[PDB]
Amino acid sequence: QYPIINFTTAGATVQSYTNFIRAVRGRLTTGADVRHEIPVLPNRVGLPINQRFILVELSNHAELSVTLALDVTNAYVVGYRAGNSAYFFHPDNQEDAEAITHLFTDVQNRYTFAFGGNYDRLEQLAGNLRENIELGNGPLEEAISALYYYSTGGTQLPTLARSFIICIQMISDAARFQYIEGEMRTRIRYNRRSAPDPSVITLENSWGRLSTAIQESNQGAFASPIQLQRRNGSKFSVYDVSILIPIIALMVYRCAPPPSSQF
Amino acid sequence: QYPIINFTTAGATVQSYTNFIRAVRGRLTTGADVRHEIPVLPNRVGLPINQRFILVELSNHAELSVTLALDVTNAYVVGYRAGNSAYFFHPDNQEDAEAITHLFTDVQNRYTFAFGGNYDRLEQLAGNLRENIELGNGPLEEAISALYYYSTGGTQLPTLARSFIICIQMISDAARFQYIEGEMRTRIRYNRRSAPDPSVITLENSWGRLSTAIQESNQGAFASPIQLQRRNGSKFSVYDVSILIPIIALMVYRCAPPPSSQF
């Protein structure tokens, strides 16, 4: 009964991927909360369980499907289902462990991994950093197959971890950043896979801090600048929300917005 | 041959005043230069003399007219004509003294005041501060008559200075600030004259510094905050251009905009 958004890598185009990411954002955030033109995800505090998750059903040209579950409070992939098995990342706390019992409730085999789904852990398991893992439609096609065959022994753990890394960036981080969506659109448009450059990686790593800096800013002005990287690895200093409006599409909730306090 | 914009206090309404201020802004600035949604006046450096001034022809219910000349580089009233006499404020420099020789060239009697047209000087001459000089349609009607009768001895210097103070705020400062335009619209809507409150005065006093702070900002963020006042005299700190977008309609040119430098 949680909302489902479908995407397939089979015959994917820039437009079908764009439609997908736009639909994911529309199910993640309501429109209740915008700070400087930038939407905020729902606050976890008090959020009813019936509103906590969305489902992303991924299919591929191999005619396989898996369903990822995303937490609306942070766009995190918390687990997935393939046929009669579901797997969840190690929960951070008891409330999250209870919350995930509301997902895939009729699945016959439920497993919780001992490891979390954060980049650092998944890179260690994959034996490769994000900077050496290619992204694009082909990688996502392959990742869907790898997730699908895990329960039957066909997928080694490093491949599973790599596959999660691909899914998370192409779905969660693309949802979080129009810039990252744009980078995936380019890969799809040319059907050319490639690892993420420093601009993509530094945005992924900075999403939480950017969210806080924007929400705690003085009328948009950061108290302390945030350093990002350009595609060539050189430094890009962020002093203000303004430069991020084309870049970041949604934020994790970090504080209540201060009073309007217009002149 | 400089552009002329007409306004009359006779039967003035919110809409006729709004039309006037919008037309004045359209003749002051071209649209070539916008920083954070806020237009910038032309740079004085290299500005051809044929593009340097605009004329505001003011009429009143008494069937009198005067023409103010405004410098497009700063929206300053530099002088005025009434019938066969023209009067100019004391120029700041030789280039400005030459520039004003291009105004009202067929007038039979040309005078340059020994005093400048800045608020501080005009308040001293008027024997009253801006905070004690009522603004509104009635004050402007009266100011037009006072300017008109100056050359024939009917207007004492303090009344002339008061009249300039009214004109400058209701035309130049209204053009510079949508907020000040709004305050004059309110006075016209209710036909109720009243002196400017601290929010109006502090904006007038801060226009140059706000212009510089916006143009020198880091992506909109001020390096140092600017203190304004609310209507009740309490402090309002400005940290960012964002809060000024509804308030300031044009800026004096202070520097070239830095390169776009988008992420």
PDB file of N, CA and C in Angstrom, chain A residues 164-238:
ATOM      1  N   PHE A 164      24.261  -2.137  -5.180  1.00  0.00           N
ATOM      2  CA  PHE A 164      23.622  -1.162  -4.310  1.00  0.00           C
ATOM      3  C   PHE A 164      24.180   0.221  -4.539  1.00  0.00           C
ATOM      4  N   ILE A 165      25.493   0.331  -4.689  1.00  0.00           N
ATOM      5  CA  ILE A 165      26.129   1.630  -4.933  1.00  0.00           C
ATOM      6  C   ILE A 165      25.582   2.273  -6.204  1.00  0.00           C
ATOM      7  N   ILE A 166      25.399   1.480  -7.243  1.00  0.00           N
ATOM      8  CA  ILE A 166      24.854   1.998  -8.488  1.00  0.00           C
ATOM      9  C   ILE A 166      23.424   2.464  -8.274  1.00  0.00           C
ATOM     10  N   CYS A 167      22.600   1.622  -7.651  1.00  0.00           N
ATOM     11  CA  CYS A 167      21.187   1.964  -7.444  1.00  0.00           C
ATOM     12  C   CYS A 167      21.005   3.201  -6.612  1.00  0.00           C
ATOM     13  N   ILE A 168      21.758   3.295  -5.534  1.00  0.00           N
ATOM     14  CA  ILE A 168      21.618   4.416  -4.632  1.00  0.00           C
ATOM     15  C   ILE A 168      21.956   5.711  -5.344  1.00  0.00           C
ATOM     16  N   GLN A 169      23.039   5.737  -6.121  1.00  0.00           N
ATOM     17  CA  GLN A 169      23.382   6.998  -6.775  1.00  0.00           C
ATOM     18  C   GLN A 169      22.392   7.366  -7.868  1.00  0.00           C
ATOM     19  N   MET A 170      21.952   6.373  -8.627  1.00  0.00           N
ATOM     20  CA  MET A 170      21.100   6.636  -9.775  1.00  0.00           C
ATOM     21  C   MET A 170      19.654   6.902  -9.418  1.00  0.00           C
ATOM     22  N   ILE A 171      19.280   6.612  -8.179  1.00  0.00           N
ATOM     23  CA  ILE A 171      17.913   6.813  -7.727  1.00  0.00           C
ATOM     24  C   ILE A 171      17.890   7.832  -6.583  1.00  0.00           C
ATOM     25  N   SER A 172      18.479   7.489  -5.422  1.00  0.00           N
ATOM     26  CA  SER A 172      18.457   8.407  -4.287  1.00  0.00           C
ATOM     27  C   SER A 172      19.217   9.698  -4.562  1.00  0.00           C
ATOM     28  N   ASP A 173      20.469   9.595  -5.019  1.00  0.00           N
ATOM     29  CA  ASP A 173      21.231  10.825  -5.221  1.00  0.00           C
ATOM     30  C   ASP A 173      20.752  11.629  -6.407  1.00  0.00           C
ATOM     31  N   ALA A 174      20.258  10.956  -7.451  1.00  0.00           N
ATOM     32  CA  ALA A 174      19.607  11.680  -8.530  1.00  0.00           C
ATOM     33  C   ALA A 174      18.349  12.400  -8.056  1.00  0.00           C
ATOM     34  N   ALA A 175      17.581  11.769  -7.164  1.00  0.00           N
ATOM     35  CA  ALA A 175      16.439  12.459  -6.612  1.00  0.00           C
ATOM     36  C   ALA A 175      16.834  13.672  -5.780  1.00  0.00           C
ATOM     37  N   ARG A 176      17.908  13.501  -5.008  1.00  0.00           N
ATOM     38  CA  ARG A 176      18.376  14.579  -4.120  1.00  0.00           C
ATOM     39  C   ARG A 176      18.947  15.763  -4.898  1.00  0.00           C
ATOM     40  N   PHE A 177      19.562  15.515  -6.058  1.00  0.00           N
ATOM     41  CA  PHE A 177      20.295  16.579  -6.786  1.00  0.00           C
ATOM     42  C   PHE A 177      19.940  16.591  -8.249  1.00  0.00           C
ATOM     43  N   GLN A 178      19.359  17.682  -8.712  1.00  0.00           N
ATOM     44  CA  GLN A 178      19.157  17.826 -10.176  1.00  0.00           C
ATOM     45  C   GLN A 178      20.453  17.688 -10.915  1.00  0.00           C
ATOM     46  N   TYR A 179      21.543  18.105 -10.303  1.00  0.00           N
ATOM     47  CA  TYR A 179      22.840  17.986 -10.970  1.00  0.00           C
ATOM     48  C   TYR A 179      23.199  16.534 -11.240  1.00  0.00           C
ATOM     49  N   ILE A 180      22.951  15.674 -10.250  1.00  0.00           N
ATOM     50  CA  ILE A 180      23.255  14.259 -10.402  1.00  0.00           C
ATOM     51  C   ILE A 180      22.262  13.605 -11.371  1.00  0.00           C
ATOM     52  N   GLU A 181      20.984  13.963 -11.297  1.00  0.00           N
ATOM     53  CA  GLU A 181      20.033  13.522 -12.317  1.00  0.00           C
ATOM     54  C   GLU A 181      20.564  13.878 -13.697  1.00  0.00           C
ATOM     55  N   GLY A 182      21.056  15.109 -13.861  1.00  0.00           N
ATOM     56  CA  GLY A 182      21.567  15.557 -15.177  1.00  0.00           C
ATOM     57  C   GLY A 182      22.735  14.723 -15.634  1.00  0.00           C
ATOM     58  N   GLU A 183      23.626  14.388 -14.722  1.00  0.00           N
ATOM     59  CA  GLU A 183      24.754  13.527 -15.073  1.00  0.00           C
ATOM     60  C   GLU A 183      24.299  12.137 -15.495  1.00  0.00           C
ATOM     61  N   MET A 184      23.225  11.620 -14.899  1.00  0.00           N
ATOM     62  CA  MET A 184      22.731  10.319 -15.328  1.00  0.00           C
ATOM     63  C   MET A 184      21.985  10.441 -16.661  1.00  0.00           C
ATOM     64  N   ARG A 185      21.257  11.536 -16.852  1.00  0.00           N
ATOM     65  CA  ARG A 185      20.604  11.782 -18.145  1.00  0.00           C
ATOM     66  C   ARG A 185      21.640  11.770 -19.255  1.00  0.00           C
ATOM     67  N   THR A 186      22.788  12.418 -19.052  1.00  0.00           N
ATOM     68  CA  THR A 186      23.851  12.429 -20.080  1.00  0.00           C
ATOM     69  C   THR A 186      24.323  11.013 -20.402  1.00  0.00           C
ATOM     70  N   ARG A 187      24.556  10.201 -19.377  1.00  0.00           N
ATOM     71  CA  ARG A 187      25.007   8.829 -19.606  1.00  0.00           C
ATOM     72  C   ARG A 187      23.973   8.053 -20.393  1.00  0.00           C
ATOM     73  N   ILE A 188      22.692   8.269 -20.107  1.00  0.00           N
ATOM     74  CA  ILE A 188      21.633   7.555 -20.812  1.00  0.00           C
ATOM     75  C   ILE A 188      21.509   8.066 -22.229  1.00  0.00           C
ATOM     76  N   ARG A 189      21.595   9.371 -22.429  1.00  0.00           N
ATOM     77  CA  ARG A 189      21.423   9.942 -23.744  1.00  0.00           C
ATOM     78  C   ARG A 189      22.436   9.350 -24.727  1.00  0.00           C
ATOM     79  N   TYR A 190      23.665   9.162 -24.279  1.00  0.00           N
ATOM     80  CA  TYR A 190      24.756   8.668 -25.159  1.00  0.00           C
ATOM     81  C   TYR A 190      24.997   7.156 -24.989  1.00  0.00           C
ATOM     82  N   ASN A 191      24.244   6.515 -24.111  1.00  0.00           N
ATOM     83  CA  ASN A 191      24.448   5.126 -23.736  1.00  0.00           C
ATOM     84  C   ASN A 191      25.911   4.846 -23.431  1.00  0.00           C
ATOM     85  N   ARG A 192      26.507   5.725 -22.625  1.00  0.00           N
ATOM     86  CA  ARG A 192      27.922   5.620 -22.275  1.00  0.00           C
ATOM     87  C   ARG A 192      28.077   5.608 -20.768  1.00  0.00           C
ATOM     88  N   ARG A 193      28.539   4.487 -20.229  1.00  0.00           N
ATOM     89  CA  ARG A 193      28.735   4.342 -18.793  1.00  0.00           C
ATOM     90  C   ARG A 193      30.064   4.960 -18.378  1.00  0.00           C
ATOM     91  N   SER A 194      30.109   5.505 -17.171  1.00  0.00           N
ATOM     92  CA  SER A 194      31.328   6.113 -16.648  1.00  0.00           C
ATOM     93  C   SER A 194      31.145   6.337 -15.161  1.00  0.00           C
ATOM     94  N   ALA A 195      32.244   6.240 -14.428  1.00  0.00           N
ATOM     95  CA  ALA A 195      32.245   6.499 -13.006  1.00  0.00           C
ATOM     96  C   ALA A 195      31.985   7.969 -12.708  1.00  0.00           C
ATOM     97  N   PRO A 196      31.421   8.258 -11.531  1.00  0.00           N
ATOM     98  CA  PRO A 196      31.142   9.655 -11.174  1.00  0.00           C
ATOM     99  C   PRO A 196      32.416  10.486 -10.925  1.00  0.00           C
ATOM    100  N   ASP A 197      32.413  11.696 -11.453  1.00  0.00           N
ATOM    101  CA  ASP A 197      33.536  12.605 -11.309  1.00  0.00           C
ATOM    102  C   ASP A 197      33.444  13.260  -9.910  1.00  0.00           C
ATOM    103  N   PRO A 198      34.457  14.036  -9.519  1.00  0.00           N
ATOM    104  CA  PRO A 198      34.468  14.640  -8.192  1.00  0.00           C
ATOM    105  C   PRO A 198      33.301  15.551  -7.887  1.00  0.00           C
ATOM    106  N   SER A 199      32.693  16.166  -8.893  1.00  0.00           N
ATOM    107  CA  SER A 199      31.561  17.033  -8.611  1.00  0.00           C
ATOM    108  C   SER A 199      30.390  16.202  -8.081  1.00  0.00           C
ATOM    109  N   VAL A 200      30.214  15.000  -8.627  1.00  0.00           N
ATOM    110  CA  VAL A 200      29.135  14.111  -8.201  1.00  0.00           C
ATOM    111  C   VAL A 200      29.437  13.561  -6.811  1.00  0.00           C
ATOM    112  N   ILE A 201      30.668  13.088  -6.616  1.00  0.00           N
ATOM    113  CA  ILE A 201      31.016  12.492  -5.345  1.00  0.00           C
ATOM    114  C   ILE A 201      30.920  13.506  -4.211  1.00  0.00           C
ATOM    115  N   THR A 202      31.426  14.721  -4.429  1.00  0.00           N
ATOM    116  CA  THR A 202      31.430  15.684  -3.345  1.00  0.00           C
ATOM    117  C   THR A 202      30.024  16.150  -3.009  1.00  0.00           C
ATOM    118  N   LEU A 203      29.147  16.266  -4.006  1.00  0.00           N
ATOM    119  CA  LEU A 203      27.742  16.536  -3.691  1.00  0.00           C
ATOM    120  C   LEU A 203      27.124  15.412  -2.870  1.00  0.00           C
ATOM    121  N   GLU A 204      27.336  14.149  -3.284  1.00  0.00           N
ATOM    122  CA  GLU A 204      26.795  13.028  -2.499  1.00  0.00           C
ATOM    123  C   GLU A 204      27.256  13.096  -1.071  1.00  0.00           C
ATOM    124  N   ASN A 205      28.548  13.371  -0.879  1.00  0.00           N
ATOM    125  CA  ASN A 205      29.112  13.388   0.473  1.00  0.00           C
ATOM    126  C   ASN A 205      28.645  14.566   1.301  1.00  0.00           C
ATOM    127  N   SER A 206      28.213  15.637   0.648  1.00  0.00           N
ATOM    128  CA  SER A 206      27.916  16.873   1.346  1.00  0.00           C
ATOM    129  C   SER A 206      26.426  17.110   1.532  1.00  0.00           C
ATOM    130  N   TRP A 207      25.577  16.164   1.115  1.00  0.00           N
ATOM    131  CA  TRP A 207      24.132  16.433   1.105  1.00  0.00           C
ATOM    132  C   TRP A 207      23.619  16.815   2.477  1.00  0.00           C
ATOM    133  N   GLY A 208      24.030  16.094   3.512  1.00  0.00           N
ATOM    134  CA  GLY A 208      23.545  16.428   4.848  1.00  0.00           C
ATOM    135  C   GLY A 208      23.992  17.792   5.324  1.00  0.00           C
ATOM    136  N   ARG A 209      25.264  18.107   5.093  1.00  0.00           N
ATOM    137  CA  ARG A 209      25.821  19.396   5.518  1.00  0.00           C
ATOM    138  C   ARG A 209      25.225  20.544   4.708  1.00  0.00           C
ATOM    139  N   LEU A 210      24.997  20.341   3.407  1.00  0.00           N
ATOM    140  CA  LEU A 210      24.339  21.368   2.599  1.00  0.00           C
ATOM    141  C   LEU A 210      22.918  21.631   3.108  1.00  0.00           C
ATOM    142  N   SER A 211      22.211  20.548   3.437  1.00  0.00           N
ATOM    143  CA  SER A 211      20.861  20.661   4.002  1.00  0.00           C
ATOM    144  C   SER A 211      20.869  21.511   5.267  1.00  0.00           C
ATOM    145  N   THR A 212      21.780  21.195   6.200  1.00  0.00           N
ATOM    146  CA  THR A 212      21.862  21.965   7.437  1.00  0.00           C
ATOM    147  C   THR A 212      22.271  23.415   7.180  1.00  0.00           C
ATOM    148  N   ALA A 213      23.270  23.616   6.325  1.00  0.00           N
ATOM    149  CA  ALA A 213      23.749  24.977   6.088  1.00  0.00           C
ATOM    150  C   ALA A 213      22.643  25.856   5.482  1.00  0.00           C
ATOM    151  N   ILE A 214      21.856  25.286   4.565  1.00  0.00           N
ATOM    152  CA  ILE A 214      20.778  26.052   3.956  1.00  0.00           C
ATOM    153  C   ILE A 214      19.725  26.378   5.014  1.00  0.00           C
ATOM    154  N   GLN A 215      19.333  25.365   5.786  1.00  0.00           N
ATOM    155  CA  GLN A 215      18.248  25.569   6.732  1.00  0.00           C
ATOM    156  C   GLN A 215      18.612  26.459   7.912  1.00  0.00           C
ATOM    157  N   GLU A 216      19.884  26.451   8.289  1.00  0.00           N
ATOM    158  CA  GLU A 216      20.392  27.310   9.373  1.00  0.00           C
ATOM    159  C   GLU A 216      20.970  28.619   8.917  1.00  0.00           C
ATOM    160  N   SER A 217      20.929  28.867   7.618  1.00  0.00           N
ATOM    161  CA  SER A 217      21.516  30.087   7.052  1.00  0.00           C
ATOM    162  C   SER A 217      20.822  31.334   7.546  1.00  0.00           C
ATOM    163  N   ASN A 218      21.527  32.452   7.430  1.00  0.00           N
ATOM    164  CA  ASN A 218      20.927  33.761   7.697  1.00  0.00           C
ATOM    165  C   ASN A 218      20.425  34.324   6.380  1.00  0.00           C
ATOM    166  N   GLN A 219      19.126  34.178   6.141  1.00  0.00           N
ATOM    167  CA  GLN A 219      18.518  34.689   4.907  1.00  0.00           C
ATOM    168  C   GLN A 219      19.194  34.100   3.668  1.00  0.00           C
ATOM    169  N   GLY A 220      19.695  32.867   3.783  1.00  0.00           N
ATOM    170  CA  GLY A 220      20.367  32.217   2.656  1.00  0.00           C
ATOM    171  C   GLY A 220      21.877  32.204   2.762  1.00  0.00           C
ATOM    172  N   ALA A 221      22.424  33.090   3.600  1.00  0.00           N
ATOM    173  CA  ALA A 221      23.878  33.219   3.717  1.00  0.00           C
ATOM    174  C   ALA A 221      24.433  32.199   4.692  1.00  0.00           C
ATOM    175  N   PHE A 222      25.411  31.419   4.257  1.00  0.00           N
ATOM    176  CA  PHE A 222      26.030  30.425   5.178  1.00  0.00           C
ATOM    177  C   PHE A 222      26.942  31.124   6.175  1.00  0.00           C
ATOM    178  N   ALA A 223      26.968  30.619   7.410  1.00  0.00           N
ATOM    179  CA  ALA A 223      27.888  31.148   8.410  1.00  0.00           C
ATOM    180  C   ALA A 223      29.304  30.697   8.086  1.00  0.00           C
ATOM    181  N   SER A 224      29.405  29.486   7.560  1.00  0.00           N
ATOM    182  CA  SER A 224      30.690  28.985   7.120  1.00  0.00           C
ATOM    183  C   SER A 224      30.546  28.354   5.748  1.00  0.00           C
ATOM    184  N   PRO A 225      31.509  28.621   4.870  1.00  0.00           N
ATOM    185  CA  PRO A 225      31.366  28.106   3.513  1.00  0.00           C
ATOM    186  C   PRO A 225      31.530  26.603   3.486  1.00  0.00           C
ATOM    187  N   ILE A 226      30.956  25.991   2.457  1.00  0.00           N
ATOM    188  CA  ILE A 226      31.132  24.551   2.194  1.00  0.00           C
ATOM    189  C   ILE A 226      31.957  24.375   0.938  1.00  0.00           C
ATOM    190  N   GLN A 227      32.997  23.542   0.995  1.00  0.00           N
ATOM    191  CA  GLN A 227      33.818  23.294  -0.174  1.00  0.00           C
ATOM    192  C   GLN A 227      33.332  22.080  -0.930  1.00  0.00           C
ATOM    193  N   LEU A 228      33.070  22.292  -2.209  1.00  0.00           N
ATOM    194  CA  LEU A 228      32.734  21.203  -3.127  1.00  0.00           C
ATOM    195  C   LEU A 228      33.866  21.083  -4.134  1.00  0.00           C
ATOM    196  N   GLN A 229      33.740  20.170  -5.088  1.00  0.00           N
ATOM    197  CA  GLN A 229      34.701  20.071  -6.187  1.00  0.00           C
ATOM    198  C   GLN A 229      34.005  20.184  -7.519  1.00  0.00           C
ATOM    199  N   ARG A 230      34.715  20.780  -8.472  1.00  0.00           N
ATOM    200  CA  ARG A 230      34.327  20.797  -9.858  1.00  0.00           C
ATOM    201  C   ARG A 230      34.674  19.460 -10.490  1.00  0.00           C
ATOM    202  N   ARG A 231      34.210  19.271 -11.717  1.00  0.00           N
ATOM    203  CA  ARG A 231      34.475  18.037 -12.458  1.00  0.00           C
ATOM    204  C   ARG A 231      35.970  17.724 -12.532  1.00  0.00           C
ATOM    205  N   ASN A 232      36.814  18.751 -12.625  1.00  0.00           N
ATOM    206  CA  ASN A 232      38.260  18.515 -12.688  1.00  0.00           C
ATOM    207  C   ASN A 232      38.955  18.353 -11.337  1.00  0.00           C
ATOM    208  N   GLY A 233      38.152  18.318 -10.270  1.00  0.00           N
ATOM    209  CA  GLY A 233      38.693  18.120  -8.939  1.00  0.00           C
ATOM    210  C   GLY A 233      39.070  19.395  -8.204  1.00  0.00           C
ATOM    211  N   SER A 234      39.021  20.532  -8.897  1.00  0.00           N
ATOM    212  CA  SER A 234      39.350  21.799  -8.244  1.00  0.00           C
ATOM    213  C   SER A 234      38.235  22.258  -7.294  1.00  0.00           C
ATOM    214  N   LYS A 235      38.596  23.123  -6.361  1.00  0.00           N
ATOM    215  CA  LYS A 235      37.696  23.569  -5.289  1.00  0.00           C
ATOM    216  C   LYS A 235      36.622  24.549  -5.785  1.00  0.00           C
ATOM    217  N   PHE A 236      35.406  24.374  -5.268  1.00  0.00           N
ATOM    218  CA  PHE A 236      34.276  25.284  -5.514  1.00  0.00           C
ATOM    219  C   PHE A 236      33.681  25.632  -4.136  1.00  0.00           C
ATOM    220  N   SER A 237      33.838  26.888  -3.701  1.00  0.00           N
ATOM    221  CA  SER A 237      33.311  27.313  -2.389  1.00  0.00           C
ATOM    222  C   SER A 237      31.861  27.768  -2.494  1.00  0.00           C
ATOM    223  N   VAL A 238      31.032  27.265  -1.588  1.00  0.00           N
ATOM    224  CA  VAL A 238      29.612  27.620  -1.523  1.00  0.00           C
ATOM    225  C   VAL A 238      29.380  28.478  -0.299  1.00  0.00           C
TER     226      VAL A 238
END
